[PDB]
Amino acid sequence: RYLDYPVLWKILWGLVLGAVFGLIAGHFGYAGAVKTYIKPFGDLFVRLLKMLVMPIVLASLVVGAASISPARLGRVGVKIVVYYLATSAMAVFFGLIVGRLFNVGANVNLGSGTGKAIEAQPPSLVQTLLNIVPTNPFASLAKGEVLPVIFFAIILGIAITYLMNRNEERVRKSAETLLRVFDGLAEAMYLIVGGVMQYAPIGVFALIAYVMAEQGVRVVGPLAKVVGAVYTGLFLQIVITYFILLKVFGIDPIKFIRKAKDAMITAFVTRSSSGTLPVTMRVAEEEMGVDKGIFSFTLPLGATINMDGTALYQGVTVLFVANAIGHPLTLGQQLVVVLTAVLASIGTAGVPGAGAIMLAMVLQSVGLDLTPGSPVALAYAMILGIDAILDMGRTMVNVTGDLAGTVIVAKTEKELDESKWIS
Amino acid sequence: RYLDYPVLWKILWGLVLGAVFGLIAGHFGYAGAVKTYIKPFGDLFVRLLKMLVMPIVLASLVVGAASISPARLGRVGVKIVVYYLATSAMAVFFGLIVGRLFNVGANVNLGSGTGKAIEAQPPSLVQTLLNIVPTNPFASLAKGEVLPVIFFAIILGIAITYLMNRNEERVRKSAETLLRVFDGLAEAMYLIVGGVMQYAPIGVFALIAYVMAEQGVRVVGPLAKVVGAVYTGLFLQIVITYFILLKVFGIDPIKFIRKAKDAMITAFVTRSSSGTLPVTMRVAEEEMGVDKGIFSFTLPLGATINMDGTALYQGVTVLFVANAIGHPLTLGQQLVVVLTAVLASIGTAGVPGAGAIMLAMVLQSVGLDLTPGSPVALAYAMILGIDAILDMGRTMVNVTGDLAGTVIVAKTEKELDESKWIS
Amino acid sequence: RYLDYPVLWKILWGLVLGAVFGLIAGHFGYAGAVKTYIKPFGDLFVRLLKMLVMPIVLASLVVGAASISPARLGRVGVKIVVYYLATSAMAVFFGLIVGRLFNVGANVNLGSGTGKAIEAQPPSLVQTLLNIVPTNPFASLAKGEVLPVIFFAIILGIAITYLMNRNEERVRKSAETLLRVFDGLAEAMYLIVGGVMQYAPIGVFALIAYVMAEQGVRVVGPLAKVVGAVYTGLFLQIVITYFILLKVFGIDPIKFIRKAKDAMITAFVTRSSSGTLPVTMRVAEEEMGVDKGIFSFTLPLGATINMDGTALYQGVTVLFVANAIGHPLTLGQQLVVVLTAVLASIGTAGVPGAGAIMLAMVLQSVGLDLTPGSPVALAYAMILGIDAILDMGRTMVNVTGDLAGTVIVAKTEKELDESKWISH
Ligand SMILES: CCCCCCCCCCO[C@@H]1O[C@H](CO)[C@@H](O[C@H]2O[C@H](CO)[C@@H](O)[C@H](O)[C@H]2O)[C@H](O)[C@H]1O
Ligand SMILES: CCCCCCCCCCO[C@@H]1O[C@H](CO)[C@@H](O[C@H]2O[C@H](CO)[C@@H](O)[C@H](O)[C@H]2O)[C@H](O)[C@H]1O
Ligand SMILES: CCCCCCCCCCO[C@@H]1O[C@H](CO)[C@@H](O[C@H]2O[C@H](CO)[C@@H](O)[C@H](O)[C@H]2O)[C@H](O)[C@H]1O
Ligand SMILES: COc1ccc(NNc2ccc(CO[C@H](C(=O)O)[C@H](N)C(=O)O)cc2)cc1
Ligand SMILES: COc1ccc(NNc2ccc(CO[C@H](C(=O)O)[C@H](N)C(=O)O)cc2)cc1
Ligand SMILES: COc1ccc(NNc2ccc(CO[C@H](C(=O)O)[C@H](N)C(=O)O)cc2)cc1
Ligand code: NA
Ligand code: NA
Ligand code: NA
Ligand code: NA
Ligand code: NA
Ligand code: NA
Ligand code: NA
Ligand code: NA
Ligand code: NA
């Protein structure tokens, strides 16, 4: 009966009300009630979005790659990958700066030795890259492996267009029927996304409420300085790095944020950027006028290998652990941090649990090892204690970057529909 | 050269001849010979039907949900879910009455104390409900999970019609092609079902022969009284609850039974209600003139959450165990049994191995705990010795109940083709 | 600068140069460099082909089985199954003969008793056949199970044609839309196969280089005599068994080999006959003019259950193991070897790891049990040390056999497009 009220204001209301409710409920210790009675609605939201990810990516990308020439596709890939690597480097640098500014971990005062022992491996760059090519697309679809689905969909769309420009008519009509099936399937997926966003304010309320209820009490002391530094840094990544790059390429930054708000809040509360994809792709299509041939490729690629927020978070936690055990990082060490954070975004691309794998990687890069019972393990466990509060903002900036790079690359390909940007 | 003989007579011939053959073979100790040389033909039958179950459900429901309004679909869902719960409670009630009538387990005379060991909880009501929404539909498909497939199929068909009512013609043609692909897939599945029913008499013979050969010798003494009670009770659920409910809503009970006979025998020999689905849906369409938009939703839902036969069986075996250890159940305990049996059919919806889980739930509700080496454990182990003999009948009544509810709901929606019911 | 160069010359160049590069690199011990820097390009080739296998099999067979009568489908199946069994028995027989000729394992001189404790057992034939019928075709697709996919695809195509010959227009239009979705999918797949064959010279070079670099050093002494015996036997299976059967049914054997070349080299370096399937089928369609209704059924079936090369290898290795432990095989024991090798091709149909399982079966059939630490176990490990050098050749002859039988059945069904066999 509440469907008639506008949706976007509803999602903002749910964000604020779930936040206030969760703080008030967890401060009085009723956070277990929140986990039991409030959370499953946010879980329902998250499952409803996650359901759409595999069909909408596959279908949108067959369609888009078909509707575009391979030369342009390759050009878009080169552009978006450069944009991604550059923005990740910027975000590590920002995390380093805001951490040094907030002087994070300076008052934990742990005594620490000089011992160093490795934990996880980087999956070999060669094996990860080879793993981009699926050996069974039905299996990748069933397993939800995004990158090989991207690869298979691109190949299929390119094949479909080559077949449609052939002389035999049976060939054209077959390929055309196939492309119709993908086109209808993607059309339906975006329809359902719009339907689920009707339920979205409830889920936003529930997710933000549970995260504030379980982890609000923990935002005090040195971890409070961590939360403040991380969130200020994310804010800087948005209002400086994104606004300036959007301003250079002639996109009004405020119009961009106003349009992106739904994808942003969905990322902020589901803490899954892949599970925000249906909202992100529909936002790119029906708000920013990006052509399917751009966003249907850049946005899943970006959910997988483009996490500015995570990079900034790594920049803060390396400072936190280093200052916490008493060995602040030398300039060259911070350069090593930036370099390895970007290389680690590439190296763990698509690997499950790559969050902790990259963090172990960066820490290992400057000589901070997670040996059990050591002070470094202790400080890292300190951070993981507020990892969810951080995950909200981290995921939000991860998705927002994807949208900003998609709009920039599109404007540079004249595949951006200007009619949506007129006041 | 045998195909020419009519199918229905062939299936009856296979049923009766397999029963007599299996009894004669288990009496002469050749039941292992039956397991080795006769059984694989029935296994072949079962594999051929189970092969069709996933595609036919996915496609028939995309199509059906497209051909119907969401308001009507929801109305049908409420009708069938009410019908399901009501007939399930009735079946527990009948099992209790037929159990008291046969005085089941009265002469086992096991001594059992007043000792009580606390056990684990039943699978969560909330998580099974959330499990209805898939997080990857390709994955639910690969795993054979019916309920998430129903959910995805309904969402997809609804999206498809809303797309077919758009102004742009490319969108309509895309959606129309997608629907054509699903319509062809469903037509082919039903074609194949009819082909498999030609091989059905052989497999029916083999399955009934293996079950009689392995478990004929065990229908003696107290377990024979159990078999008599359970089969009498199922017969009552059919001839009282189903016939009275069909007469109340104006469906000829005898024509119903005659049309459902193929689904009935198939369920009785395969003891899997989910695997009789292709035959059941074919009977709903090409024998009872039920509209696809009703049965394509109610019949898979019914295979999953509507087991009158299992409910009656639980009523009989809970009385059997209570009498065998020497503590007959008080009236309020039997009420607790009925309430718990229905709620446990809901709570275990789609859960693998849900049969024993429901039985454990019902037993624990009245304080008969299955501690190993206890007399209660012994009584349950007695019953399991005849589980196949019982499984035939209870699966049969499970599926027949599904059909009766589909025909009644269709009749109330004027979605029932009256021409198939006049001679 | 690459694509314009002719294709056949490039793949042969990559094969010869990769082999010489790998020998020279492993003969000087740089095989670790090859495994690290050269191998991953060949791995990329193998994955690119493996990707296409499930889609192309499903789609080609829905389309093909629709485009053919069920009576003809059955006739083709019986023909190709007889051909497969006969050519397999011939291959075990040839392996025995070339083994006797090279006197394989004759100078290993291990002492062996006559006690044998049963360790292996056969996987049930009945369950192996029943597994042909999938119980979830989406699951068989996701698990990469070929044989049950074949079954589902044939059922679906047959249903589709029966629907397309019905009175209602809506049903025809539905079934035909479905058939076109599969036809479009298959057309795209073959398009992609041809595209991937552009990278083939690199990947062929890399695979052959890695195998030569890891295993060249081991082709000396008794295992060298094994390599010579096996490759001679494979060559004979091609030049006698295949050439005579093609000549008998009126197919020019030289035209045949010239056409099969891509499938042959691809099978030879990837050592996966199922994973060579996309190249084999594109060669059958776009080189030999076999109708989709023949090859879309016979080639994946043969990739799964028809291994002339593996059978010849078993023929050689059983004589090798027997001579190596000092108990040469009786004539009737050799007949049991042939009979069980053929039966073991069926009994493991689609079973994972069926290579070693068939070898264990054939060994056990003549009383050589692979109990750990026994001398028979030791001789088997000797053989396994060169399994890659042997896998190249036996996979090549496996696939070549599939092609030859497909073309013969096609000639007998007048489903072979003779215009592809006229030279100017
Ligand atoms: C207690 C909460 C329970 C809520 C669950 C019920 C969901 C009901 C859906 C109502 O919301 C609408 O759904 C449409 C899709 O069904 C969307 O159409 C949208 O989707 C199309 C995409 O094809 C766009 O082109 C259209 O512009 C656009 O109106 C539309 O935005 C949205 O308002
Ligand atoms: C593993 C190998 C096992 C081998 C088993 C043998 C396979 C069966 C051979 C085919 O037999 C025919 O198949 C038709 C398929 O259509 C059936 O028509 C059925 O389907 C159509 C429904 O539209 C209608 O023609 C009829 O109502 C209905 O009899 C029909 O009964 C039957 O004569
Ligand atoms: C990791 C990156 C790997 C990328 C793979 C390399 C791409 C190579 C560039 C494209 O080369 C062409 O691509 C076509 C396929 O797209 C092929 O068409 C072929 O396929 C058709 C099949 O329908 C035939 O009819 C045509 O004659 C035939 O030219 C063609 O041979 C090939 O020269
Ligand atoms: C339940 O067991 C498992 C199993 C696997 C997993 N994760 N795999 C994975 C991979 C990448 C990330 C990046 O993370 C972002 C962040 O944290 O900054 C943020 N969450 C976002 O989506 O952008 C995170 C996780 C997690 C739990
Ligand atoms: C490996 O085999 C499997 C595979 C999956 C499962 N889980 N799903 C499930 C859920 C409920 C039942 C109740 O069963 C009915 C009965 O006994 O009254 C009768 N069989 C029937 O279908 O109406 C039976 C199974 C169980 C066994
Ligand atoms: C995808 O990962 C996998 C999946 C499966 C496996 N093993 N299963 C298997 C391996 C080989 C064969 C027959 O072997 C042939 C031979 O050597 O003679 C030769 N290799 C050929 O291709 O014809 C039969 C079954 C290994 C890795
Ligand atoms: Na980035
Ligand atoms: Na994610
Ligand atoms: Na991202
Ligand atoms: Na019921
Ligand atoms: Na079942
Ligand atoms: Na049922
Ligand atoms: Na053969
Ligand atoms: Na293989
Ligand atoms: Na083969």
Side-chain angles (χ1 to χ4, degrees), chain A residues 84-85 87-88 306 308:
Chain A
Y84 282 166
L85 293 181
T87 40
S88 280
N306 176 83
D308 288 348

Side-chain angles (χ1 to χ4, degrees), chain B residues 10 12 79 100 138 251 255 283-284 302 319 338 343-344 359:
Chain B
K10 277 198 304 194
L12 264 187
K79 287 185 176 62
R100 173 155 205 157
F138 300 117
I251 300 98
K255 284 170 176 154
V283 158
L319 279 209
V338 178
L343 299 179
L359 199 40

Side-chain angles (χ1 to χ4, degrees), chain C residues 72-93:
Chain C
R72 168 172 278 173
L73 197 45
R75 191 168 56 254
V76 170
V78 170
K79 289 184 177 179
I80 203 63
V81 156
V82 166
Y83 165 83
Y84 283 167
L85 298 184
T87 38
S88 280
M90 202 63 52
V92 187
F93 175 76

Side-chain angles (χ1 to χ4, degrees), chain C residues 88 92 120-123 304-315 317-318 337-338 340-365 370 380 398:
Chain C
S88 280
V92 187
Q121 278 178 1
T304 295
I305 66 164
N306 177 86
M307 275 120 172
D308 285 344
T310 303
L312 188 133
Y313 162 89
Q314 286 156 4
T317 62
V318 160
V337 162
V338 177
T340 69
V342 171
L343 299 177
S345 189
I346 295 158
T348 49
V351 172
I357 298 184
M358 286 168 69
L359 198 42
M361 272 181 274
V362 179
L363 285 182
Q364 172 169 6
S365 75
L370 289 80
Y380 177 59
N398 295 337

Side-chain angles (χ1 to χ4, degrees), chain B residues 291-363:
Chain B
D291 196 75
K292 221 157 199 160
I294 311 300
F295 72 76
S296 79
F297 166 66
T298 58
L299 284 190
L301 182 71
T304 295
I305 65 165
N306 178 84
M307 278 133 162
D308 286 348
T310 297
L312 188 134
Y313 159 88
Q314 284 161 1
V316 178
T317 63
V318 58
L319 279 209
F320 170 85
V321 165
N323 295 327
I325 74 172
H327 304 293
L329 290 166
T330 54
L331 213 53
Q333 264 171 338
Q334 313 201 43
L335 296 179
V336 168
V337 162
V338 178
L339 181 145
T340 285
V342 169
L343 299 179
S345 187
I346 292 159
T348 204
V351 171
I357 297 183
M358 287 168 70
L359 199 40
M361 271 182 271
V362 179
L363 288 189

Side-chain angles (χ1 to χ4, degrees), chain C residues 20-36:
Chain C
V20 167
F21 184 78
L23 288 179
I24 284 170
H27 185 272
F28 286 155
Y30 287 102
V34 180
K35 182 179 169 85
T36 279

Side-chain angles (χ1 to χ4, degrees), chain A residues 6-292:
Chain A
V7 153
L8 67 101
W9 291 87
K10 277 196 303 196
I11 280 188
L12 264 185
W13 268 124
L15 187 54
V16 156
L17 258 55
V20 169
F21 185 78
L23 288 177
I24 283 169
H27 177 271
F28 290 154
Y30 292 75
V34 181
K35 184 179 172 188
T36 284
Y37 295 145
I38 303 311
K39 176 171 180 278
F41 296 127
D43 291 341
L44 183 55
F45 180 39
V46 179
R47 300 194 76 150
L48 281 167
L49 284 177
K50 180 57 212 180
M51 164 178 50
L52 309 162
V53 185
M54 287 316 293
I56 199 169
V57 165
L58 174 65
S60 292
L61 188 57
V62 164
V63 156
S67 88
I68 197 193
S69 81
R72 168 173 280 171
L73 199 47
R75 187 167 53 253
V76 169
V78 174
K79 290 183 178 180
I80 202 63
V81 157
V82 164
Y83 166 83
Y84 282 166
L85 293 181
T87 40
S88 280
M90 205 63 53
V92 188
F93 186 77
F94 266 83
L96 289 164
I97 288 185
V98 175
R100 177 152 208 154
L101 205 166
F102 278 70
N103 218 23
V104 281
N107 298 331
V108 191
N109 307 314
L110 296 178
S112 180
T114 182
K116 169 168 182 173
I118 307 100
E119 283 293 338
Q121 274 182 0
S124 37
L125 266 189
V126 167
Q127 188 53 50
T128 303
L129 303 188
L130 281 186
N131 283 339
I132 282 166
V133 175
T135 62
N136 176 320
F138 298 109
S140 295
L141 281 176
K143 293 170 182 290
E145 302 172 9
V146 159
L147 285 200
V149 163
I150 289 188
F151 183 97
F152 184 72
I154 287 177
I155 307 309
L156 185 55
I158 290 197
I160 278 170
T161 280
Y162 276 89
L163 294 171
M164 270 171 157
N165 300 315
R166 295 279 266 258
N167 276 337
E168 301 93 13
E169 196 194 297
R170 177 192 60 77
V171 173
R172 282 198 307 272
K173 194 57 203 283
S174 284
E176 186 193 313
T177 309
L178 179 63
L179 188 53
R180 277 198 307 272
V181 179
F182 282 109
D183 206 2
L185 180 62
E187 297 294 352
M189 279 327 119
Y190 289 87
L191 204 49
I192 302 154
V193 178
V196 157
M197 285 311 260
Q198 212 57 222
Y199 176 75
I202 290 292
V204 161
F205 171 93
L207 297 179
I208 189 76
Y210 165 71
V211 170
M212 289 325 275
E214 296 280 7
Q215 291 206 2
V217 280
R218 310 209 179 145
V219 195
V220 294
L223 290 184
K225 277 196 188 174
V226 153
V227 174
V230 156
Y231 268 76
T232 296
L234 301 171
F235 172 84
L236 289 189
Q237 181 75 342
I238 296 189
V239 300
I240 285 162
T241 315
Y242 295 160
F243 283 18
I244 285 177
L245 288 171
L246 294 169
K247 274 183 166 291
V248 154
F249 288 85
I251 298 97
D252 186 77
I254 306 301
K255 286 169 174 155
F256 175 79
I257 270 64
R258 291 174 64 81
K259 300 167 172 316
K261 91 196 155 307
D262 276 26
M264 297 200 194
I265 295 177
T266 302
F268 184 96
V269 303
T270 60
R271 296 176 305 288
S272 170
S273 100
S274 100
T276 303
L277 260 206
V279 168
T280 312
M281 290 174 123
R282 140 183 259 241
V283 161
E285 182 194 80
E286 310 178 7
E287 286 268 346
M288 317 213 169
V290 186
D291 191 71
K292 224 152 201 157

